[PDB]
Amino acid sequence: FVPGLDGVVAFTTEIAEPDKDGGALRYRGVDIEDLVSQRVTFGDVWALLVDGNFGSGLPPAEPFPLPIHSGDVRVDVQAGLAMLAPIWGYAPLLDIDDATARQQLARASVMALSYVAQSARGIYQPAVPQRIIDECSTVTARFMTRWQGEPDPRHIEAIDAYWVSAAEHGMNASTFTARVIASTGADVAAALSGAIGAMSGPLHGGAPARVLPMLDEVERAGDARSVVKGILDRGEKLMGFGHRVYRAEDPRARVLRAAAERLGAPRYEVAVAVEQAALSELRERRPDRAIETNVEFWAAVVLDFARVPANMMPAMFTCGRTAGWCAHILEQKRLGKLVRPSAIYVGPGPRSPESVDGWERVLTT
Amino acid sequence: FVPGLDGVVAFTTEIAEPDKDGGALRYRGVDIEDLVSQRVTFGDVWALLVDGNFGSGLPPAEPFPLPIHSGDVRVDVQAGLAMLAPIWGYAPLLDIDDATARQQLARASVMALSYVAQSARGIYQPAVPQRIIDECSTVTARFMTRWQGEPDPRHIEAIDAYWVSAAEHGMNASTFTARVIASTGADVAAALSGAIGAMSGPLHGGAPARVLPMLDEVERAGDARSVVKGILDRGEKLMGFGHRVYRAEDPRARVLRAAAERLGAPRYEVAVAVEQAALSELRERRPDRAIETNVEFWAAVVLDFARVPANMMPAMFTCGRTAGWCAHILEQKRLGKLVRPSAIYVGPGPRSPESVDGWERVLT
């Protein structure tokens, strides 16, 4: 066997379909290009993924000043979400019905958004009054107001595009963690907290790429191709590009590019020039390799347009992905099967404690 | 198709061997009955599991008053551990060397123990002074001092037998979660925190059995065989007894029973009477079924002996299992392979937004 469950089928799902061979991504049958093009807000896509229909949008967050101030936006929301269970009375999934689980997921997902916005705004600024946030028509607009105070309305549009494009993507490591924890019958806040832990790993995939240094060089140099070849000729890796994920173009990368164009993002010109220079450069140097634009490249562009800083981009990814996590947590609840893979010991057989390196340093009672 | 990877091999491991067909459990080749009977302390078994050798025992916890007081000891530690990464400067596993990751695991693993002892003691007691903890000679002693102030040496011995017997047991949902998170390159405090979330589910298994009521009745009623028949006649389940786990006796159950006998646990006589009565009565009612004593039956006895309240025994199980969690995080770091299973879509085919129920409610 090959370590890592790579391509091993753990579940069937009705939630969404990353149709990679067909080059398309659908939520409950609905193509994401429709949702983003037709401006469906994140809170409605949340309900789409979780419930299967547009019946009950994500409710706004109740007032709740973030209790965790750790210096890391991801850490604040991971810790603060786990803490919701005792104060809000979240029982283990085993002990509640589906309607209760669905209500707890919605209440905690939007509070995850609230916590991120407060953590990003940070403790050195007074909080934004609830009455100003209450003037907002969507959860996404509320998030951006709670964080920035007076967000640019196109920046709200950018984030609504990113979050809907990032909401769900099959069985990645953080969605898997969510389902593993839920499969123990744990409360939903514990499963969301653990998912955030997995999402924090730089190898998770989908984490917005570190392309801002590159995009600032082309802005101050103008020769896109020269900058790309400078990075490769020095041996450094090209950020935001690599092996294909979908059959050709990642549909998520297409819609995020169409958003940064839509909204007039000032970097859209340099980013387009870098996408073509990097694709042509990598493809030439290895004609036997499939090279595509990682969705992470246009995520960094759309997030940076909306004023999301580099160290906040993993938390913004987390925010969008709460929709899929909650969808999979609910489905896992109804599945009612504990996740239980195994491992085989491969190594030396029995030996005495006295034969172990360093036994001489052990003190016994 | 069988969902849930049931029986699927996810990893090879060099950490430990639950040799169930052989009736033995080994840590890095060393039998747990040798470890427990020779009274090797948890902090040294921590190093055995994680490092594969002895010598660099788990260090004492640095002073750090627990910042989370949520009402739930499990929550306090899950949150509290994740917050260790920014204040201590824990970088992602992907960006540090193995020895740095091992050091971070050790520092955070013992802080988990510290936080549990504090969270248990509770906010309505003053903390025990670090100078009194510093008079202890083992991490397990330091934990019982931090929690109880003046713990009984026999109770420290009981916890040391328990924790070592609980340190590691192959793949389970919390160990799996720790490795999955570690496989993303995340920092080790984020992997430990998520593992705690999985440990917390009632179906994870391995938690000390809820046998104190039954043990209390036999202590008063006086007849073990009578109470166990009552409980099965009333339609309830005999707590701490069931299908075999090892081929015969769970070696961890044996060593804990022996510790309870050796340390003079007041409930030892009733518990042994309850074990024999329950085993006879269950086996006599179903001769075709293998029945053995769950290790978790004696785990509860040993933990109750050490003055651990029932509501604080899952947390004690978590404390012991930190050794296995850290070993698997370090092994997953060395494996360097993202865990990436897949799912088959069986839901709705392509459709338009407007075709979905409730599209009329949606606003542009």
Beta strands in A132-255 (DSSP E): 241-243
Nearest CA-CA partner of B11 in B177, B176, B204: B176
Separation between Cα atoms, residue B5 and residue B277, nearest integer Å: 37
d(CA A315, CA A134): 23
Give CA–CA dist B181/B177, Å, rounded: 6
Is residue A139 a contact partner of residue A58, using CB atoms and an 8 Å limit? yes
How many residues comprise chain B? 364
The catalytic site residues of B sit at: 243, 296
Q: C-alpha distances in angstroms, A262 versus A155, A246, A267, A303?
A: 12, 24, 12, 14
| Closest alpha carbon to B184 in A240, A347, A252, A200 | A200
What SS3 state is found at B27? strand
**In the beta sheet, which residues pair with residue B292?**
B242
- From CA B214, how far away is CA B228, in angstroms rounded? 8
A293 conformational bin, left if phi > 0, alpha if psi -120 to 50, beta if neither: beta
Nearest to A39 by CA among B349, B353, B350: B353
**Quick one: chain A helix, strand, coil %, rounded to 5?**
55, 5, 40
For chain B, the distance separating the N- and C-terminal CA atoms, rounded to the nearest angstrom, is 42
The whole-angstrom distance between A272's CA and the closest CA on chain B is 29
Of A78, A173, A183, the CB nearest to B340: A173
- Measured CA to CA in angstroms, residue B173 lies from B75, B199, B201, B206, B288 at distances of 17, 7, 9, 11, 30
Distances (CA, A) of A206 to A89, B103, B142, B202: 33, 29, 43, 32
A110, containing H or E segment: helix A98-121
Closest residue by Cα to residue B299 from B280, B313, B285: B313
Cβ contact B150:A321 at 8 Å: no
At A358, which helix (H) or strand (E)? none
**Residue A157 and residue A152: Cα distance in Å, rounded?**
9
Helix (H) or strand (E) holding A10: strand A9-13
Lookup: tokens for A92:
């283990």
Q: In this complex, do A183 and B200 lie within 8 Å of one another by their Cβ atoms?
A: no
Is residue B343 within 8 A of residue A171, CB to CB? The reply is: yes
- For every residue of B69-84, DSSP letters joined together read --S-HHHHHHHHHHTH
Of A184, A337, A350, the CB nearest to B198: A184
Asked whether the CA dihedral B303, B304, B305, B306 is positive or negative, the reply is positive
Query: Burial code of A157-179, b = ≥16 C-beta within 10 A, e = fewer?
Result: bbbbbbbbbbbbbbbbbbbbbbb
Q: Encoding tokens for residue B15?
A: 């950490």
- How far apart CA B116 and CA B205 sit, in angstroms, is 20
CB-based contact A361:B51 (threshold 8 Å) = no
For A71: left if phi > 0, alpha if psi spans -120 to 50, otherwise beta; the answer is left
Residue A117 to residue A315: CA distance in whole angstroms: 9
Can you tell me the distance from the alpha carbon of B361 to that of A40, in angstroms, rounded to the nearest whole number?
11
User: Which value, in Å, is the radius of gyration of the alpha carbons in chain A?
Assistant: 22
Report the candidate in A254, A249, A23, A244 with the shortest Cα–Cα distance to residue A161.
A254
Q: For this experimental structure, what is the resolution in angstroms?
A: 1.8
Tokens of A315: 């938390």
DSSP β-ladder status, A30-31 and B30-31? unpaired
What is the spatial distance between Cα A182 and Cα A20, in angstroms, rounded to a whole number?
Answer: 27
Q: Is A296 helix (H, G, I), strand (E, B) or coil?
A: helix
- Report phi then psi at A227, rounded to 5: -70, -45
Q: Which residues of B fall within a CB distance of 8 Å from A53?
A: 356-358
- The minimal CB distance from B9 to the residues A82, A343, A357 is found for A343
SS3 B11: strand
Tell me how far CA of residue A104 lies from CA of A44, A77, A109, A111, A267, in angstroms. 17, 16, 8, 11, 39
> In terms of Cα–Cα distance, which of A321, A27, A61 is closest to A196?
A321
How many interface pairs between A and B have CB atoms less than 8 angstroms apart? 386
Q: Indicate left, alpha or beta for B28 from its phi (over 0: left) and psi (-120 to 50: alpha).
A: left
User: Which ranges of A5-97 would DSSP assign to H, the alpha helix?
Assistant: 32-37, 42-51, 73-82, 84-88
CB contact under 8 A, B190 and A3: no
Phi, psi values for residue B163, rounded to 5°: -60, -40
Residue B25: CA count within 13 A, CB half-sphere: 24
Which three-class secondary structure state does DSSP give residue B139? helix
User: What was the experiment behind these coordinates?
Assistant: X-ray
What is d(CA A51, CA A331) in angstroms, rounded to the nearest whole number?
Answer: 10
Q: Where are the alpha helices (DSSP H) in B153-211?
A: 153-166, 173-183, 188-199
Tell if the CB–CB gap between A200 and B190 is shorter than 8 Å: yes
Q: Is residue A316 packed enough to be buried (19+ CB in 10 Å), middle (13-18) or exposed (0-12)?
A: buried
Q: Look at the block and give the residue holding tokens 């740095």.
A: B100
B57 token code pair: 């025992």
Question: How far is residue A325's CA from residue A329's CA, in Å, rounded to a whole number?
Answer: 6
Tokens describing residue B324: 């296995």
> Is A328 a known active-site residue?
no
A258 three-class SS? helix
Q: Which of A308, A35, A55 is nearest to A168 (CA)?
A: A35
Q: Which residues of A180-214 are buried (b: 16+ CB within 10 A; e: fewer)?
A: bbbbbbbbbbbbbbbbbbbbbbbbbbbbbbebbeb
Instruction: Write the DSSP string, A29-41.
Output: TEEHHHHHHTT--
User: For the purposes of burial, counting CB atoms within 10 Å of the CB of A3, is it exposed (0-12), middle (13-18) or buried (19 or more)?
Assistant: middle
H/E stretch holding A16 reads strand A16-19
- Sequence-distant (≥ 6) Cβ neighbours of residue B8 within 8 angstroms: A5, A8, A10, A341, A342
- Given an 8 Å threshold on Cβ–Cβ distance, is B12 in contact with A3? yes
User: Of B176, B163, B178, nearest to B208 (Cα)?
Assistant: B163
3-state secondary structure of A348: coil
Three state DSSP letters for B244-302:
CCCCCCCHHHHHHHHHHHHHCCCCHHHHHHHHHHHHHHHHHHCCCCCCEECHHHHHHHH
Residue ranges of alpha helices (H) inside A286-365 are 295-305, 313-335
The answer to whether the Cα torsion of B196, B201, B202, B205 is positive or negative is negative
Angle between helices A42-51 and A98-121 (to 10 degrees): 150
DSSP B321-363: HHHHHHHHHHHHHHH------EEEE-S--SB-GGGSTTTTT--
Residue B25's SS3 state is strand
Q: Which token pair is A307?
A: 């004023």
Residue B251 CA to residue B165 CA, distance in Å, equals 9
For residue B207, the one-letter residue type is A
Angle, CA of B70, B76 and B82, to the nearest 5°: 130
CA end-to-end span of chain A, whole Å?
Answer: 44
- Between CA B330 and CA B55 the distance in angstroms is 17
User: What number of other Cβ atoms are within 10 A of residue B210's Cβ?
Assistant: 15
Kindly state the DSSP code that residue B54 receives in the 8-state scheme: S
> Rounded CA gap, B247 and B108, in Å?
36
What is each CA distance from B217 to B267, B270, B287, B299, B358, in whole angstroms?
A: 12, 10, 27, 19, 57
CA dihedral B78, B79, B81, B83 (to 10 degrees): 160
CB contact under 8 A, A79 and B68: yes
DSSP one-letter code for A204:
S
Instruction: Identify the DSSP state of B19.
Output: E
For A343, which DSSP code?
E
Question: Which chain A residues are Cβ-neighbours of B41 within 8 angstroms?
Answer: 363, 365
- 3-class secondary structure, A24: strand
Neighbours of B25 (CB within 10 A): 25
Nearest CA in chain A to B34: A353
